[PDB]
Amino acid sequence: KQKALAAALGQIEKQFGKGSIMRLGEDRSMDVETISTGSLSLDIALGAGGLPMGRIVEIYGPESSGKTTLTLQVIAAAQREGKTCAFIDAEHALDPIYARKLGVDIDNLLCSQPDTGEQALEICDALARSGAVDVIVVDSVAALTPKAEIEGLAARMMSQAMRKLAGNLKQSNTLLIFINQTTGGNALKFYASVRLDIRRIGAVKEGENVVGSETRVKVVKNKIAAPFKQAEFQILYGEGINFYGELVDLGVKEKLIEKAGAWYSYKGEKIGQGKANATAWLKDNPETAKEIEKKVRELLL
Amino acid sequence: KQKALAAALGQIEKQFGKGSIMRLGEDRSMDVETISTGSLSLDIALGAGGLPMGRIVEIYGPESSGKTTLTLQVIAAAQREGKTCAFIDAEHALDPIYARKLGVDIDNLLCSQPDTGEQALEICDALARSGAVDVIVVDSVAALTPKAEIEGLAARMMSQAMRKLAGNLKQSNTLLIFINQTTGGNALKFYASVRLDIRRIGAVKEGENVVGSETRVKVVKNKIAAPFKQAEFQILYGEGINFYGELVDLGVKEKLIEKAGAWYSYKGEKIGQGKANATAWLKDNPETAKEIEKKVRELLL
Amino acid sequence: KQKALAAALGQIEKQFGKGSIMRLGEDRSMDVETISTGSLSLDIALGAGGLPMGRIVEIYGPESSGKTTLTLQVIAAAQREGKTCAFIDAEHALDPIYARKLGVDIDNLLCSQPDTGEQALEICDALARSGAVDVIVVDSVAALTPKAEIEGLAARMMSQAMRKLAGNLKQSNTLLIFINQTTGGNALKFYASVRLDIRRIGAVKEGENVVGSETRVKVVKNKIAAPFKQAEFQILYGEGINFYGELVDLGVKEKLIEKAGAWYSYKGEKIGQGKANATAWLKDNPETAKEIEKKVRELLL
Amino acid sequence: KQKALAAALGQIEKQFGKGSIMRLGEDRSMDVETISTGSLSLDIALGAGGLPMGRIVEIYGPESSGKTTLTLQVIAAAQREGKTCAFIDAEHALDPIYARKLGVDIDNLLCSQPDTGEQALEICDALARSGAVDVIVVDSVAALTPKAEIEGLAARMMSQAMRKLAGNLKQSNTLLIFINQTTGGNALKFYASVRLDIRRIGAVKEGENVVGSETRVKVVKNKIAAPFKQAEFQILYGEGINFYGELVDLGVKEKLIEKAGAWYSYKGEKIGQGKANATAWLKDNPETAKEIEKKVRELLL
Amino acid sequence: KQKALAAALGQIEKQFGKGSIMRLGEDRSMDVETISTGSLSLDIALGAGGLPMGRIVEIYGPESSGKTTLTLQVIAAAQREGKTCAFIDAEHALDPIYARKLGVDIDNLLCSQPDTGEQALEICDALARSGAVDVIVVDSVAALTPKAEIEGLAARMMSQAMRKLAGNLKQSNTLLIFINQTTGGNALKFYASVRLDIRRIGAVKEGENVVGSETRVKVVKNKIAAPFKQAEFQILYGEGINFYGELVDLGVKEKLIEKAGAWYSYKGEKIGQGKANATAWLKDNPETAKEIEKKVRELLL
Amino acid sequence: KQKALAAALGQIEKQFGKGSIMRLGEDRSMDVETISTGSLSLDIALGAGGLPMGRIVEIYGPESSGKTTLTLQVIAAAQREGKTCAFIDAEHALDPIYARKLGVDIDNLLCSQPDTGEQALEICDALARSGAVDVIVVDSVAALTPKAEIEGLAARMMSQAMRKLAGNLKQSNTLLIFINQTTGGNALKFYASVRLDIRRIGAVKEGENVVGSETRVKVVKNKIAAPFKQAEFQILYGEGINFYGELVDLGVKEKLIEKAGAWYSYKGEKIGQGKANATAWLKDNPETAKEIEKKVRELLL
Numbered sequence A, B, C, D, E, F: 001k002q003k004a005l006a007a008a009l010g011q012i013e014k015q016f017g018k019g020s021i022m023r024l025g026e027d028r029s030m031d032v033e034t035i036s037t038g039s040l041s042l043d044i045a046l047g048a049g050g051l052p053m054g055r056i057v058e059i060y061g062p063e064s065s066g067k068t069t070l071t072l073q074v075i076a077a078a079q080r081e082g083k084t085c086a087f088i089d090a091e092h093a094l095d096p097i098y099a100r101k102l103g104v105d106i107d108n109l110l111c112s113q114p115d116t117g118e119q120a121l122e123i124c125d126a127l128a129r130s131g132a133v134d135v136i137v138v139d140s141v142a143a144l145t146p147k148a149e150i151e152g153l154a155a156r157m158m159s160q161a162m163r164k165l166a167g168n169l170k171q172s173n174t175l176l177i178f179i180n181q182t183t184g185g186n187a188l189k190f191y192a193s194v195r196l197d198i199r200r201i202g203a204v205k206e207g208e209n210v211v212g213s214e215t216r217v218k219v220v221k222n223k224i225a226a227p228f229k230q231a232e233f234q235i236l237y238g239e240g241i242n243f244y245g246e247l248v249d250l251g252v253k254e255k256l257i258e259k260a261g262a263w264y265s266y267k268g269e270k271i272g273q274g275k276a277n278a279t280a281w282l283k284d285n286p287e288t289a290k291e292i293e294k295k296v297r298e299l300l301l
Helices: A002-016 A040-045 A067-079 A096-101 A117-130 A153-171 A187-191 A243-253 A275-284 A286-300 B002-016 B040-045 B067-079 B096-101 B117-130 B153-171 B187-191 B243-253 B275-284 B286-300 C002-016 C040-045 C067-079 C096-101 C117-130 C153-171 C187-191 C243-253 C275-284 C286-300 D002-016 D040-045 D067-079 D096-101 D117-130 D153-171 D187-191 D243-253 D275-284 D286-300 E002-016 E040-045 E067-079 E096-101 E117-130 E153-171 E187-191 E243-253 E275-284 E286-300 F002-016 F040-045 F067-079 F096-101 F117-130 F153-171 F187-191 F243-253 F275-284 F286-300
Strands: A056-060 A085-089 A110-112 A135-139 A175-180 A194-206 A209-222 A230-236 A258-260 A263-266 A269-273 B056-060 B085-089 B110-112 B135-139 B175-180 B194-206 B209-222 B230-236 B258-260 B263-266 B269-273 C056-060 C085-089 C110-112 C135-139 C175-180 C194-206 C209-222 C230-236 C258-260 C263-266 C269-273 D056-060 D085-089 D110-112 D135-139 D175-180 D194-206 D209-222 D230-236 D258-260 D263-266 D269-273 E056-060 E085-089 E110-112 E135-139 E175-180 E194-206 E209-222 E230-236 E258-260 E263-266 E269-273 F056-060 F085-089 F110-112 F135-139 F175-180 F194-206 F209-222 F230-236 F258-260 F263-266 F269-273
Touching: A002 B117, A040 A209, A040 A230, A040 A243, A040 A286, A056 A067, A056 A153, A056 A187, A067 A085, A067 A096, A067 A135, A067 A175, A067 A194, A085 A117, A117 A135, A117 A153, A117 D002, A153 A175, A153 A187, A194 A230, A230 A243, A243 A263, A243 A275, A243 A286, A263 A275, A269 A275, A275 A286, B002 C117, B040 B209, B040 B230, B040 B243, B040 B286, B056 B067, B056 B153, B056 B187, B067 B085, B067 B096, B067 B135, B067 B175, B067 B194, B085 B117, B117 B135, B117 B153, B153 B175, B153 B187, B194 B230, B230 B243, B243 B263, B243 B275, B243 B286, B263 B275, B269 B275, B275 B286, C040 C209, C040 C230, C040 C243, C040 C286, C056 C067, C056 C153, C056 C187, C067 C085, C067 C096, C067 C135, C067 C175, C067 C194, C085 C117, C117 C135, C117 C153, C153 C175, C153 C187, C194 C230, C230 C243, C243 C263, C243 C275, C243 C286, C263 C275, C269 C275, C275 C286, D040 D209, D040 D230, D040 D243, D040 D286, D056 D067, D056 D153, D056 D187, D067 D085, D067 D096, D067 D135, D067 D175, D067 D194, D085 D117, D117 D135, D117 D153, D117 E002, D153 D175, D153 D187, D194 D230, D230 D243, D243 D263, D243 D275, D243 D286, D263 D275, D269 D275, D275 D286, E040 E209, E040 E230, E040 E243, E040 E286, E056 E067, E056 E153, E056 E187, E067 E085, E067 E096, E067 E135, E067 E175, E067 E194, E085 E117, E117 E135, E117 E153, E117 F002, E153 E175, E153 E187, E194 E230, E230 E243, E243 E263, E243 E275, E243 E286, E263 E275, E269 E275, E275 E286, F040 F209, F040 F230, F040 F243, F040 F286, F056 F067, F056 F153, F056 F187, F067 F085, F067 F096, F067 F135, F067 F175, F067 F194, F085 F117, F117 F135, F117 F153, F153 F175, F153 F187, F194 F230, F230 F243, F243 F263, F243 F275, F243 F286, F263 F275, F269 F275, F275 F286
Parallel strands: A056 A175, A056 A194, A085 A110, A085 A135, A135 A175, B056 B175, B056 B194, B085 B110, B085 B135, B135 B175, C056 C175, C056 C194, C085 C110, C085 C135, C135 C175, D056 D175, D056 D194, D085 D110, D085 D135, D135 D175, E056 E175, E056 E194, E085 E110, E085 E135, E135 E175, F056 F175, F056 F194, F085 F110, F085 F135, F135 F175
Antiparallel strands: A194 A209, A209 A230, A258 A263, A263 A269, B194 B209, B209 B230, B258 B263, B263 B269, C194 C209, C209 C230, C258 C263, C263 C269, D194 D209, D209 D230, D258 D263, D263 D269, E194 E209, E209 E230, E258 E263, E263 E269, F194 F209, F209 F230, F258 F263, F263 F269
């Protein structure tokens, strides 16, 4: 049994690939380079600590769900490591000011505003084949209007280009993210290695005023590690993902940070009173947080 | 007549198998291992007290009909007995939190999110041949997009794989459930030993608020026992199937529980006033209910 | 002429059988045992007062035409006389609750849900040869999927089995009814002794609400008596065919029931005011209606 | 890398055209004749110093956003250079008095008030093919009612005519501007070389009274130079765009004008105390401002 | 250029009709019979000296704007020339006393107070086809309640009848005026040859008391001559449009009347001191004013 | 012309009914039975000499306008001829004492004080269908509160019942009057054959004291004769309409009564000195006035 189980299981893996079947409880992630999403709770949920390079990723949610902020944060993290990013825009909504406050190197962000949906996919493929771009972001699947319509179709346009793109993105190790509201048929649903469902579940108030959104992200599909885990974090208006806020919570769960009622302490010293202050501290001590985060990752990844 | 009747009848049985013809009134169920559906009224309707191992089962209903809750409950019951379960997902909708509140051992639930419809069927076949999995659940037939379409077909894909799967599932005694909305042609309709039609018929209110769904399940096909019997039960949000609620009703019908207007009693003592309280009691006295349930089964199965 | 006419006519009859030619106006029905259809107006249209035993009958109409209700009513009438009935199901749609409200002895109804179309036909043949079943009902011709398709064909499958079935059904005096939507080719069209075309022509309203269907049935083929006569009756939801309603109308046409504007009388006494009340009465006086019906039959059959 | 980057990048350009991809930070504008928008801060944001001739431009914003003032200013600038302008009106709102105070040569402004939306597009095409008009302005997309509606449709009407118009406007080097509130589908969104988003963000007060609007314009689409840059300027009631006001601010940013607390100086002499006075001066010394503006352009374009 | 300009321009005209495009500065009016509006400054603004016969005209403004007075004045002028007028009333507000003081021949004014909006439009069409009525006035578009509403719709009702009406009004050379507050959709907006926007901009005081309204009329649409010109005049309570008052002002602008500070003179003699007296004079010398007016028209039309 | 005019005109009449168009100057009234309003000047303005039977009439004016007095006077005149009257009250304001001083037969006045607005309309319809009531008066439209509101709506309630009421009131020749302040939408505005606008324009003083109201009534809608004529008369407190006062004035206008400065004479003899005395006389000589009135009517009607 337990012998023939892990046995056949392996059979399915060589016969169908890595991750063709998994115990939802397993921790075994694959050997894949990963770009952070900007959320520590999400990087964890993902299993590999971030989004897999060379794969197609889908991020979808309603309006004001925070799906753009997410995609921007990954661009920031990517660029923050020397990775060249390209933004394929069909929405014409990018807010460079907000992007900058998030760490995006707007000046070096490659941008394309294609004439049709087919053109966008084609420009994506070309970039994929250049082996010169590390991450591509398509904003968004719903805006990718087929040439015919500009002058059913959408599903065929996506299908018509998904196999080639995937192969090319794989061969050059390029990460590609499609932002969606799902439109485009099943091509994207099945070729994607990761599919994220993001939505606003509440508000973040600074007393009487609203300063952010209480966000939830579910990894509904994951071919790199176990799927169905979720992540909750805050997106503060004009600032982005409350990372350090997560670091506090997760630093206390994994018992790396001590909480004495309202006081948080790390290895001998106090860092602050209240989540509000603990966060303030960590954000105030870069090299320390990088250490706490690293332990949290080693522990949970 | 009555002699030549039961005579020819038997002839049809050896010539065509067990259950090729049945008096809808008969009680003769076959010698088959069965996994509970989580509904006592359904286990009864099924005749064999549950779903038959080694057979293909189809469960279908509209959106929000409770077909997933049902399939989850059987996984729970299965795992709750040491059976290894696999969830072949093509919907990417599994809610692990809700599953857990239902008793599913998420950690040990095997999960596969195949690249195509053909791949899913193939992974099912492999698992069927491993003789290492006890129950497989495919979610769902409509999402099993054929490779060709990803790049008529659906009906051929199902047919193309149904005979082999059935043989393999039979030889290893593996139970396989297809969740459907019917799509896939006739292959599934004819190979399935049990076909369940589930739908939401009303709401369950806790006064002014809605806390669940009034559900009805019809066994439209049954090759293990007489078909066409139905079952009615409640699915409480965040909790699952109101089993003990059924146990009360069925415990009173079969006269195992005495009802004095609003008071329910079992063998000398009172257990509660009102269906609400009787249920509360039974759910509060595990070993007692297991006894009442056992009598109800011996009586009705 | 008139001499040589009836002369040659007879010649065609001995040379080709009974009913190979008929004056549409004739009344001469054959010596055949007949099961009621549940409609008095239909039993009449049929000429022999019902469906002929030992023959193949086809009943066809669109969805919601009332073709199932019809077939159920004949099963009821059959069982209501000690006849053993078998329901060969390939639709998996039987509603036992509604069947019961119609008089069907569900408990004693034999039921078979075959693996293929060929199997169903074969099970029919076997039952036909048992000489133990009086009436068989196949639901339905369109659902009788050929094995090949499950893994042109339909027409061959029907043809391949029609001659044998007919001979066997004849030798054992078994009545067989195929429900259709025509599918299956010409085999059924030519072997059937009776072909009924049924359809919903209007609604039956109880004031502001709809409580039934205004039905029409045309005997498009009849090898037992003159063909092309039609029947109109009501099918009341949850109740079946408004028989007594027919009995009133037909009781007045044949002048067995007197109508005084809005008052109906039978042999000296009044039975009710309005069709609604007359019906209520007759349904309220079983042995009286049986008498009126008997006169109506003797008169019109 | 950096070699293969600029390499593939070029590939995308020849394969897809000029500006199919751009580093948002780049300054490389194309070889295109450009008409001023009347805003120095906007001409800059545009990259090419103004709107591109021979292309379709879209300007959109809410009511009272200043989108008309903008379109009028470009007509003024155009005519102020011998360019022939045509105003395709479907709003019937043009204010000739205000237009004149802005520099529009009303007398020579060609005007058409078409019978339908299709007619307007057709008149546009004809003018485009005449090679006799330099700039066309359509007021507005939302008012372009389809003939059918006058007696879904709108999107088809726009699509039905966009390819032809674009080709014709290109061949004759005619600039065409659509004013919108977006209506008309995707045809305009994808064929447009420039899409401007304009809106009123605040008021301009002369103490206690409101004399103008604080305006913001975002270049959400730009196929002639990098997109996403924005421009802020004032629209003074009855006067138009506070150009010289911009010239002051931008003259100080680029260090061409010295600011000593409240005193502004240009090459040795003082021009005024306070933004209010500096502006007054520049507007008072035409040939001087033309020089400062020219330096600002050479520096920022 | 200037050659190919006037060239293509002509092309647009034959291809689309007369006035499909115009230099707002042009003076070329069409060959159309015209009824005076009662305002000399308006007749001029109109270009053709009045409202075009055989066309649909729209006059709209708020309550108390003077739109009725205007429509009444044209009826007066029309009747004052033998033209037969019809007043289609749905407001039930006509003031015959005031109309008379304006010159309307109430006794000969045809009047209809239709049962529905559709009926009114139909009565208009019939009158249009009679070729017996010269001018029709509909009071008012907003009161034209659709039959359905009496028992979206309004826009369809107008559209449903506009093409036919226009053709019929054209063929019989009938002038039709719709008074509006815009309601009725785009049908009227596009079929109308002239659209007038009228509103009260101030009061007219006879010292301490208010005796009239300072009115402004903008020709927002004109398919007979250049559009967008405006007219200002006074409407004196109980008297109507201060025509002669206009004649004075316009007689001085075109230098046909000499003004010596406060004295007005015409060809050698003095006519009065002050606008008040000059007007008094002209109104006192009919045949003289008719001459001055004629020169003013020849000069400005 | 004059031929084709009266021609088409007739066409509109047969096509749309009697009075679908009229020369405001015409005198041609229809063949309709009419009840006096109590005002001779109003009966005249109406054209048919009174209110049309079988039609819906609306009377509206502010508070204290005299609209009730008017409606009471018609009831008096009606009853004074054997006509049965019904007063549908929703105001609960009827003053029986004042009504009596006006000639109303309170004792025989039918009265209904309905539970809702719908009920009132329904009671009106029933009375209309009885063919037993000659005149119905609804007091008042504004008080007809819709059932829903008692527990937009008003307009629908009126519309919902206006067509039926009109047909029924027509078939039984019943006159129905709605008193209004307009409320109820357009249903009443368009179905009414006559709409009266009544208001108090001044006081009637008996020296130093005020004894009545100077009233004006405008027939703003009239489908029985030319509309827009008005009537002026006095309503004396506690007495009603100063009829004979009108008879004097109108008797002098039509030259049936001679006025010698302050003396009034009729056919040879003097009747009084001063309007005050002439009236006193006529009111003092019933059969004489009836004669003068009859001549006045023959002359002016």
